[PDB]
Amino acid sequence: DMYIERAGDITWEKDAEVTGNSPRLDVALDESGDFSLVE
Amino acid sequence: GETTDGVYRVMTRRLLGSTQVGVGVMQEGVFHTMWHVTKGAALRSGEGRLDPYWGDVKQDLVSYCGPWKLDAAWDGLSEVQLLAVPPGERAKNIQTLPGIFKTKDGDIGAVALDYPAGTSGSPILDKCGRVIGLYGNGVVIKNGSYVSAITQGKRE
Ligand SMILES: Cn1oc(C(=O)Nc2cc(Cl)cc(C(=O)NC(C)(C)CO)c2)cc1=O
Numbered sequence: 001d002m003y004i005e006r007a008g009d010i011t012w013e014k015d016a017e018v019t020g021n022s023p024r025l026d027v028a029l030d031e032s033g034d035f036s037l038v039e
Numbered sequence: 040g041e042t043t044d045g046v047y048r049v050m051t052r053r054l055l056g057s058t059q060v061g062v063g064v065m066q067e068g069v070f071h072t073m074w075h076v077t078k079g080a081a082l083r084s085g086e087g088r089l090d091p092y093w094g095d096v097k098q099d100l101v102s103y104c105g106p107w108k109l110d111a112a113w114d115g116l117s118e119v120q121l122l123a124v125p126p127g128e129r130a131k132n133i134q135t136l137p138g139i140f141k142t143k144d145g146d147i148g149a150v151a152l153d154y155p156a157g158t159s160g161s162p163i164l165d166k167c168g169r170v171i172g173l174y175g176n177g178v179v180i181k182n183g184s185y186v187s188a189i190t191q192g193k194r195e
Pocket residue numbers: 075152153154155156157158159174175176177178179183184185187
């Protein structure tokens with residue numbers, strides 16, 4: 001059986017760790033909700 | 040049981056010990072998570088029970104106790120924060136600038152951050168703190184890196 005536990009508030013934090021890139025990818029979404037790369 | 044607005048972990052006792060399968064957002068008395076996290080199954084919250092109300096495998100979304108409430112959208116320009124809730128670790132905001140998933144049916148925002156599968160359902164936030172989507176359905180590129188879509192549902 002699955003259950004939920006509170007993990008925190010939904011707020012924006014000023015001066016948070018800024019990381020990660022912004023790639024532009026050609027993708028395909030199948031009928032099962034799965035994404036795949038199209039090249 | 041617990042109907043307070045906020046971010047929640049989704050746990051199971053079926054495997055060894057307590058395992059985190061995903062994360063979700065409680066807002067306006069409705070629990071929002073990714074379909075692949077629960078597979079549409081009922082949830083427990085203290086003495087209370089949450090039953091599913093709406094869901095769609097292709098969108099990979101599910102709402103509990105009521106219809107989908109999250110409607111805010113990415114503006115296409117600004118940086119966002121992933122409010123990541125990793126398994127066994129504290130909730131942490133990671134700011135990033137989203138990329139784009141180009142599909143034959145339109146472009147969608149994408150977040151390029153590496154987190155374990157049990158982090159699926161973690162909300163993505165705008166500068167006002169509004170949930171613009173959920174993290175945890177995407178693709179694994181070239182070196183084993185993960186890129187998730189910015190998955191938002193439709194408010195009726
Ligand atoms: C089942 N099923 O799972 C998914 C899905 O998107 N899983 C998932 C989600 C996340 Cl947030 C991360 C990773 C992941 O690979 N993590 C590392 C640590 C290995 C690399 O960052 C995987 C869809 C789906 O139908």
